[PDB]
Design a protein around this ligand. Sequence first.
Ligand SMILES: CC[C@H](C)[C@H](N)C(=O)N[C@@H](Cc1ccc(O)cc1)C(=O)O
Ligand code: MG
Length: 353
Amino acid sequence: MKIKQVHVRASKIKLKETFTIALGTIESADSAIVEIETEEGLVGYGEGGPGIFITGETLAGTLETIELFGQAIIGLNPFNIEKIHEVMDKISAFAPAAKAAIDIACYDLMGQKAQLPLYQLLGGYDNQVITDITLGIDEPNVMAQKAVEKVKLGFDTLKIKVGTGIEADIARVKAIREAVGFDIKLRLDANQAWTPKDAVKAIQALADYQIELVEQPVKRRDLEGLKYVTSQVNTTIMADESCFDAQDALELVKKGTVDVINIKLMKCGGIHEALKINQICETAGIECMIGCMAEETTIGITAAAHLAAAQKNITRADLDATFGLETAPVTGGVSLEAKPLLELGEAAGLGIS
Ligand SMILES: CC[C@H](C)[C@H](N)C(=O)N[C@@H](Cc1ccc(O)cc1)C(=O)O
Ligand SMILES: [Mg+2]
């Protein structure tokens, strides 16, 4: 199998509602959709959803980088994922969205050529994944009503966004808990908003509210502060922005910084690197949660779901980016439907057309 041409295009899909997190707001999912065409005619789908307040990547930068990657990999075999990443890493020192776009399309092609659903090539542990759904920052009563609405849709796990001030954030969590009861799992995400001290204070104040875990409570560069929180509360602490790639994972494991790690294809540059992060974590006794950017869509989410289903150590999933999209840019894959169960069919590769 040989790559004949790499096609890329901008995709801009308005969100049904603006989403607010501690780092900013998003109202449109703008990504780069890649289609790698092979000599034999098979076409693999890839996507790069750059979140500027997460990685600094922009759609224009991502598009330009993908084009450079595209020309450099013509003639290569999609199965030679080792060389494909070698080439991209030599071209750019940092562009996870662009690298993920290429990587995802290559894996899609691998599955199609082998005539197997992607999850079978990535571990084969399962063929489905259960995802939580995220509640953007808003007034306590508002988030609470939304929570009740989501639970009605069948979600048993809600990811609560917080980060404007511990006082207000605690109020948000209490309102949500009171509204939905204790049969619902609640995980919090402060998106780097709290100081180490305030994080501990807030987590302790929510002790009787049965919090499943707390994601990135402190600034990403403050690994000492992150470890401080982890070592000061029994509550599970998850690293997100503090862990982009395998090297970061290796650093957090040596330091014992967190309890769990959030893996994003858009942070590590693809499935190839995501696998490394998970393997490092599993070896260290750290479970992983597959996540996503609000900028990605069907392709990115579908690839993430196949990886999450295939690997035993990826025990949690936050793959809800398609739920806010006004439209789907492609056919097949994970639906725009807001549902907790993401079942992967038997279609080869990503099952996208
Ligand atoms: C809006 C929630 C998204 C789909 C996901 N569950 C999420 O929370 N992702 C990031 C935060 C984020 C990234 C990019 C962006 O444009 C908005 C929000 C996370 O912290 O896990
Ligand atoms: Mg997060």
